Amino acid sequence: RDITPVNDETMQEINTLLIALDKTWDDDLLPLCSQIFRRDIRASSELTQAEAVKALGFLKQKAAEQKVAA
């Protein structure tokens, strides 16, 4: 509905958790967002804000659940 692009503050929160989880846009999150939202998303900046808030919730669950194994 709202196609407002992802804002910088939300992007930064996402980047922070990706780093903490030792995950990346290219290898991990852009493929998953493309699958879940059923569209070709080639760059982090192409997410809508509404899409990014759902991705952020997921990453928070991953970072809260357990330690990141070395």
Partner: peptide
């Protein structure tokens, strides 16, 4: 469908 509320591996 898979969505971001699910217990998905990452």
């Amino acid at each position: 469908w898979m969505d971001f509320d699910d217990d998905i591996p990452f």
